[PDB]
Amino acid sequence: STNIKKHVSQLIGRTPLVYLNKVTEGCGAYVAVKQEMMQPTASIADRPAYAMITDAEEKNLITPGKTTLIEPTSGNMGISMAFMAAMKGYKMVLTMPSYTSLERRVTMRAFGAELILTDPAKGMGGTVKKAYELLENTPNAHMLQQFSNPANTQVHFETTGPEIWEDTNGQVDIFVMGIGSGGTVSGVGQYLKSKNPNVKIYGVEPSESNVLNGGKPGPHHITGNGVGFKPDILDLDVMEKVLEVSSEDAVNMARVLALKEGLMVGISSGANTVAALRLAQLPENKGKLIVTVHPSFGERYLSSVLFQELRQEAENMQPVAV
């Protein structure tokens, strides 16, 4: 009868693409970026959170008011799970390393989830290990396990990829995306290549923790990428290669995106944009359409290295007389 959504979860998906022409000056390729800040919790993680929880219900694995859901996260998946659990009536417990932004912690709690922070030194690997310990010691609990759950990849094959194909009217030549769980790059990549096998798919990881390129895990600032291990769901074969972007470059670019393009986005958005620009410099990519993603909104990073200096300045601002 109307266009009014029946459920808040129906607000997930179908995000816009927009061209960049400022940070791309002189690069010689088209660059379009998908804006995942237009999701109900303002990151791309709403997609796999919805898909995994719904899949578990269809499989008759979990039950509202009975099952405790437990999930490891660098923040966004945690928020998105907290959001789904709030709506569907599940107790939600997240594990997250203590080095991720304060805003991530507060938002999870605002949706009523319980949060356990883990040793910072042990990174996402430690947060996953803690989640398994909690699972083993909690009656009637279930872990969706984003790093191993194929519904994660599938949602991107089903929705994020088709959205890119349709919005570019089949013209996308290159897709680049940083890897956290690997769900996005794997699902979008598999889909785009099923429509045009010439499409080139690139992952991105932090130079500091370049494990996919054979390096050692280490601390870095690109929250949402570089978990320090190869996720089970990551499809290595679909990617041409995994590009490396330094934490410093990713952070610097995210700041420029706000100041020059009007896009207040997260650190992984900056990393993706650096990677896309690097691809544009290559002779073989001149005149091609490169699509990447800005996976999260910048206000979730006020306390991170991205904006903490500004935040401190802002906290010390004082009123003037009128």
Add this chain to the structure above:
Amino acid sequence: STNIKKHVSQLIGRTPLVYLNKVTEGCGAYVAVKQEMMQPTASIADRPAYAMITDAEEKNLITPGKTTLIEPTSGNMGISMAFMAAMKGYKMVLTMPSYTSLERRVTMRAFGAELILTDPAKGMGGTVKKAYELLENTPNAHMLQQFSNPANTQVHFETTGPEIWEDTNGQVDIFVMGIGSGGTVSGVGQYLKSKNPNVKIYGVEPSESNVLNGGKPGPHHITGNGVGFKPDILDLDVMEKVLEVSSEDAVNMARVLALKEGLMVGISSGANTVAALRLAQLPENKGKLIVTVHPSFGERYLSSVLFQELRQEAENMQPVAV
């Protein structure tokens, strides 16, 4: 050739409506809410910011790189103007009372705008006075003046109103909206009544500063409403009446919206929702479609009274061993 937007400003507008069925339990009316978090800077102010600056350019009043734009704000307009200014190449100066959330300050600065906080005891009135002082003392400066600029009302007549009419397939019976500048309630109200004169339009103001109902200005927590004076653009005649909601009720409702409805929204969103439910309680409104707005995303309020306590708790969390 594609659906890719040419400019980031084209990401503004066309936001969804969603039904509420949890906070509305037992109320006997339909309640749908418009989600302005789906804007590029995550609040309703992107609409009037774009409309006012664009209108000024069309009238040949301002020039990028020459004109300094000055605007008084409670935060969201400031952010939206900083955003438009960053993209279009204007120097931007905002005045805002020092009592509004820290997040508002940081986001404005992230877009490169200059921010002057004003004495908190003087509220939005003082912030407007300061903006006029800066205007008088700054060469080649211009103030859009959201409280007096008809382009503010007009953008809602043109876009927010029509979106509501179309999305409800003409079925909306009642629209309710808190008043900051009064642009939204005025423009939406004017449009809806133009389509169906029987549609009833209600404003909201804080119980603490109920100046539209003849009370005195006072401090309150409903940021974005209750500026403490009647804005020039506010169309009193289009409203049945201006409802009063307490700061306490608005804040409590915003918290419940997150926990129960999965909607992480700001304090004025809570206030609108309280008002919507109060209207639903009247026998005359049973079975009617009531539409309201959630004008801003909740992460901009982490340091405000809305989530301050949770934020302090979050800051105090410590990592556990793995």
